[PDB]
Amino acid sequence: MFFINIL
Amino acid sequence: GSHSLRYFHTAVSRPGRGEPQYISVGYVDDVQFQRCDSIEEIPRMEPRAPWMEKERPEYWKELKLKVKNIAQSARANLRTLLRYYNQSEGGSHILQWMVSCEVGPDMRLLGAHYQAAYDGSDYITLNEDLSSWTAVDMVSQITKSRLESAGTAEYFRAYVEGECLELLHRFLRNGKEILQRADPPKAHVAHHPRPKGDVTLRCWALGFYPADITLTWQKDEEDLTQDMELVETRPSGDGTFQKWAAVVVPSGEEQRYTCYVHHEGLTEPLALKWR
Amino acid sequence: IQKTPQIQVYSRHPPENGKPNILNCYVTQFHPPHIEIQMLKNGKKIPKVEMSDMSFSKDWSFYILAHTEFTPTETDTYACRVKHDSMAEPKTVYWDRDM
Ligand SMILES: *[C@@H]1O[C@H](CO)[C@@H](O)[C@H](O)[C@H]1NC(C)=O
Ligand code: NA
């Protein structure tokens, strides 16, 4: 449950 | 052998009515343990494995906050992706990403993964070093340059060596009876005459876990790669999996064909002939 | 991308006439994830059809499992009908106790 910002 | 915790995330811009703007499912190995989603900004969570009944309320309370924040960030990313790819508004686009960590038989970390796709194509992937990224085009190259400038992989590693390891360890503990097993296939050959005089030999494998398996037919002096029909391994719905492979053969020559089965639960490949 | 679903229809256990069982409709290899799935017995839509959560594979294509309780016989027909945006029309697949 982890998300990285693309742009 | 080794054990893996995996999450499969999907974000959709302008989904259909009642359809999630965000959904993620989590697995240990080939066993699902939860579903999270967000519909019209409302987050919802559901357990799927028995060991999840032991989680305390704060587990679910923190998960709900994660779901809300992830769904808002994915929505924002989809909006920026539309701009960088000079796409028209109104249409619906998809952002998917996978997150996992793996430990060996002794609970030592072996690796981890982070990879994303846009509209069903690879976009960016975290390399085995857990510190550099692989892009596919000039948009994803912007993402890479930003993520490397800002050292974002450091915080992924903190997640891997923090919550991902914590949860994988506790799930394996509380769910040991389900997770720490290997059910071997039960195999047999079926025989179906065809109206032209020849015969279908169908090799079945049932009730095995994990899902990874291989089935192969072999003739006396001829390779059957191109001849045999295979179906994709499929869930029986009770935790186990099943598969079959079939060849057409002339009547009378059934006993020169042999089906071989390979699976984790087998110390040697199983061999089967008709009847 | 615009991937067409592959469909398989099969029972949980090897079928034996008159014995309660579970009928599965496994749909794979499609993209986008929106899909419509129905199961039918002798031409009638079955009301009690449960759906697994949708997930996706290494190539990013989606998959999902629909299933319902059924008792096989020698005189009953079962089908799964599936519609996806990659298809002009729905596709019906009938259960075959040999497959
Ligand atoms: C979109 O347009 C910009 C110019 O503003 C250009 O730099 C970029 O390469 C274009 N991308 C695509 C996918 O056409
Ligand atoms: Na995608």
B22 - beta bridge partners?
Answer: B11, B38
Residue with tokens 């510190």: B131
Identify which of A1, A2, A6 has the shortest CB distance to residue B77. A6
- Main-chain phi, psi angles of B12, to 5 degrees: -130, 130
Taking the C-alpha atoms of residue B234 and residue C12, their distance in angstroms, rounded to an integer, is: 10
| Helices B138-149 and B57-84: angle between axes, nearest 10 degrees | 130
CB atoms within 10 A of CB C20: 10
d(CA B114, CA A3): 9
Residue B246 · residue B200 · CB < 8 Å: yes
The CA–CA distances, whole Å, from C27 to B123, B192, B233, C32, C52 equal: 25, 26, 12, 13, 11
Q: Which positions ≥6 away from B85 have C-beta within 8 Å?
A: B139
Nearest beta carbon to residue C34 from set B16, B23, B190: B16
User: Which three-class secondary structure state does DSSP give residue C18?
Assistant: coil
Residues in contact with ligand 1 by the CB-under-6-Å rule are B 85-86
Distance CA B134, CA B115 (A): 9
> For residues C37 and C27, is the Cβ–Cβ distance under 8 A?
yes
Q: How far is CA B47 from CA B31, B107, C23, in A?
A: 12, 24, 24
Report which DSSP code applies to B254: G
How many distinct structural domains can be found in chain C?
1
Q: DSSP code of C54?
A: P
- Characterise B10 by phi-psi region: left (phi > 0), alpha (psi -120 to 50), beta (else): beta
Are B213 and B241 within 8 A, CB to CB? Answer: yes
Q: How far is B211 from chain C (nearest CA, A)?
A: 13
CA of residue B123 to ligand 1 center, whole Å: 16
User: Rounded to whole angstroms, how far apart are CA atoms C47 and B168?
Assistant: 38
User: From atom 1 of ligand 1, which residue's Cα is the shortest distance away?
Assistant: B86
Give the residue numbers spanning the domain of C79: 1-99
Where are the extended beta strands (E) located within B153-252?
186-193, 199-208, 214-218, 229-230, 234-235, 241-249
Q: CA–CA separation, B138 vs B148, rounded Å?
A: 15
- The approach used to solve this structure was X-ray
CA distances from C73 to B99, B145, B206, C15, C70 (A): 45, 62, 22, 9, 10
Buried b (16+ CB within 10 A) or exposed e, C35-58: bebbbbeeeeebeebeebbbbbee
CB contact under 8 Å between B23 and C54, yes or no, is yes
Judging contacts by C-beta atoms under 8 Å, the chain B residues touching residue C6 are 232
3-state secondary structure of B163: helix
Q: B77, A7: Cβ pair inside 8 Å?
A: yes
Q: Do A4 and B152 touch (CB under 8 A)?
A: yes
How remote is the CA of residue B96 from the centroid of ligand 2, in Å? 4
Using a 10 angstrom Cβ sphere, with 0-12 exposed, 13-18 middle and 19 or more buried, the burial of residue B86 is: exposed
Atom of ligand 1 nearest to the CA of B138: 9
Residue of B nearest to A3 (CA): B70
* B155: Cα separation from own chain's centroid: 24
CA of B8 to the centre of ligand 2 (A): 11
Chain C touched by B8 (CB under 8 Å): yes
Taking the CA of B82 as reference, the closest ligand is: 1
